[PDB]
From a paper:
In the absence of inhibitor, PRS17 crystallized in the trigonal space group of P3221 with one monomer per asymmetric unit. PR20 has a wide open flap with a separation of 19.3 Å between Ile50 Cα and the Cα of catalytic Asp25. For the lateral component, the distance between the Cα of Ile50 and Thr80 of PRS17 is 9.2 Å. The Phe53 side chain has a single conformation and lacks van der Waals contacts with the side chains of M46L or G48V.
Recently, we reported a multidrug resistant [name] [name] bearing 17 mutations named PRS17. Here, we present the first crystal structures of PRS17 in the inhibitor-free form and in complex with DRV.
Numbering used by the authors:
A (entry chain A), B (entry chain A): 1 to 99
Write the structure that this text describes.
């Protein structure tokens, strides 16, 4: 799609059977979602959040659909003020900012 | 331009004689710059930053060039971890996210 920016760029995402929403955030390096579960192994990671650092789970090679486009990449699961799609997945999408 | 996202989307900006850089941040509502001065009146505004709230100065109808494109809009001046161009100015640019 072509997404304008007069409102927050919130899109529908889907991971397996879990339909959610998230912000397309060009100011975020990584993707962080609070309201999803995944099975299997994961690696701990620290991100910055309230109180200094927050521990999240890093899941690799996750299939995720963003605004109807399927990609595969890393998803961080843990506390976040908003679900955010970061540059790691926007690169998979081939997304660009255009003006 | 057409800006890819495999690195942080940092662009050159210019306000009067003040040439700087800033991140194009679709996760930011407003534009916040730390390393610029402007003359004249301004209105105080609180934003979220380290320690809860940070006081910045709100300047209106500021002419600013972003990646070579001139626009006019509101610029917040104060502490910020990175200079950020937010959606308020990206809308003026007619910027879109495309995939
Ligand atoms: Cl599932
Ligand atoms: Cl992030
Ligand atoms: Cl620990
Ligand atoms: Cl959508
Ligand atoms: Cl990835
Ligand atoms: Cl100047
Ligand atoms: Cl902001
Ligand atoms: Cl006060
Ligand atoms: Cl530039
Ligand atoms: Cl504005």
């Amino acid at each position: 799609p072509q997404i304008t920016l007069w409102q927050r760029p919130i899109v529908t995402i889907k991971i397996g059977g879990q339909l959610r929403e998230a912000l397309l955030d060009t100011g975020a390096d990584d993707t962080v979602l609070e309201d999803i579960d995944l099975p299997g192994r994961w690696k701990p990671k620290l991100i910055v959040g309230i109180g200094g650092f927050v521990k999240v789970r890093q899941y690799e090679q996750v299939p995720i659909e963003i605004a109807g486009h399927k990609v595969v990449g890393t998803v961080l699961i843990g506390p976040t003020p908003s679900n955010i799609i970061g540059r790691n997945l926007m690169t998979q999408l081939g997304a660009t900012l255009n003006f």
